[PDB]
Design a binder for this molecule. Sequence first.
Ligand SMILES: N[C@@H](Cn1c(=O)[nH]c(=O)c2cocc21)C(=O)O
Ligand SMILES: N[C@@H](Cn1c(=O)[nH]c(=O)c2cocc21)C(=O)O
Ligand SMILES: [Cl-]
Ligand SMILES: [Cl-]
Ligand SMILES: [Cl-]
Ligand SMILES: [Cl-]
Ligand SMILES: [Li+]
Ligand SMILES: [Li+]
Lengths: 262, 262
Amino acid sequence: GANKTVVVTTILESPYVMMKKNHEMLEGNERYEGYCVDLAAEIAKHCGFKYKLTIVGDGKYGARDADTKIWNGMVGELVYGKADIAIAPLTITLVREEVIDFSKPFMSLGISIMIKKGTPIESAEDLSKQTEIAYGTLDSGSTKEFFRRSKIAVFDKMWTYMRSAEPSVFVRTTAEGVARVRKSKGKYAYLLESTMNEYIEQRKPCDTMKVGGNLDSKGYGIATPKGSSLGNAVNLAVLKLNEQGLLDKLKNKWWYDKGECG
Amino acid sequence: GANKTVVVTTILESPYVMMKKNHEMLEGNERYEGYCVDLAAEIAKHCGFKYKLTIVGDGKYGARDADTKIWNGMVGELVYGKADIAIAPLTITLVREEVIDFSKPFMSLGISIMIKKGTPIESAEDLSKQTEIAYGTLDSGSTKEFFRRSKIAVFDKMWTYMRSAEPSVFVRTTAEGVARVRKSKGKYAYLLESTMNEYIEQRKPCDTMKVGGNLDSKGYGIATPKGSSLGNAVNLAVLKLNEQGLLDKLKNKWWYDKGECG
Ligand SMILES: N[C@@H](Cn1c(=O)[nH]c(=O)c2cocc21)C(=O)O
Ligand SMILES: N[C@@H](Cn1c(=O)[nH]c(=O)c2cocc21)C(=O)O
Ligand SMILES: [Cl-]
Ligand SMILES: [Cl-]
Ligand SMILES: [Cl-]
Ligand SMILES: [Cl-]
Ligand SMILES: [Li+]
Ligand SMILES: [Li+]
């Protein structure tokens, strides 16, 4: 039948998607800005569709409840037909790949350590061998799931520590994790995706840093419902944008051109 | 119908696939060793297929002749039905994605600069601004195609330099490029994939190094003919192996555990 406007699901997470300061004077997609807003515009331009940015209702990326078998988050919105495409910092994982389609990665990343400057930690092994410096992750998402599911000795030890540490080492949002690092006088380290770690390192008050190698090597992908015709074109668009250098340009724009730490 | 042995196409390129020193005393898949040999075994274990490693007849990765429209290399073997899967350091690119299926990446990489130690070059921009130190790429493959197709000023300038430089700055094999760096007294720099650059930096006589940031960010993928049923399972296997840390283990095994430079 006739073309329809493509429903995009995304999530408010700086610098990927933010409401503009003047959003009340704007309408529709123009209310938002960020890396994923720019990426959505480029994908739509190359694929020739009109689209509407919507914000995922439950604030989650995507996981399946073990009891009800229901998928939540942006993955769920795709699985249940509430959105046509997810354009967000959504990690390509096996369990998600089984239920939705993903483009090839538009950004590479790995789990990483954020410390307050001066914290005597250089690696995941360092954290795992001690408890004076508490450490944790988001309470939902692929970083938490990495530790929960790991059979690698160091990361399994870290997960056992995280589950049993008091007070809770988990946080609900990136902002909460960053604030906790900044306010804990070196006694909290935050495990988060390297992309986000790099972004925060260039934000005032310039008191955090990424330390150590990444713990894994993953990618973010554009997601569509399994079998959706849109998937092929969107994937070719990601590859084209990468080959043209435009994904690198967008990362530089949102991470470094605007950096606040010199 | 009944299960059939899966025909794998690959290419002799160290450390991905090499003939064992004692290969004459061995048969079948046991004649070969390397990262991609180990990876093929893990993929087959997880997917439950038997397979035969074969070596691509024409020694190429995969490109389409502009006049005849015929695909060569491992891509061609898939397109024309001569192999069922390609397991090799095969870069995911747009033009290839249009004709074959690719798994999500099993290895990340970018184009990079190899110098003989002491060469006064730190970046692609450095190379592009001069001619005393000649520089080039393989005469076939995705690294050459990156420069040929680039509309980025620095890389377009480098391509124009490479096409017009005398004597020819192109090489036919990785070994030829490495040898040329080693024998040219600092007057040749080799543009190659970062993975390979890192491998060579750990090989005697320990006289090369990787310099500068990568020029792009790409991945190697396992390839199957478009629409092949094997593609889904193989892709899930790559993701599982990545999530288990086994791809990192294989890279360490073939790059660093065996490193010859300390
Ligand atoms: N990418 C993850 C969600 N996520 C995460 O787990 N850790 C982080 O530090 C993140 C920053 O932005 C999004 C993030 C997923 O897809 O679940
Ligand atoms: N990955 C490339 C082929 N290739 C390449 O172009 N440059 C290199 O330095 C390589 C090392 O191994 C394979 C390589 C393709 O798929 O064409
Ligand atoms: Cl509509
Ligand atoms: Cl282990
Ligand atoms: Cl057979
Ligand atoms: Cl440019
Ligand atoms: Li999928
Ligand atoms: Li494809």
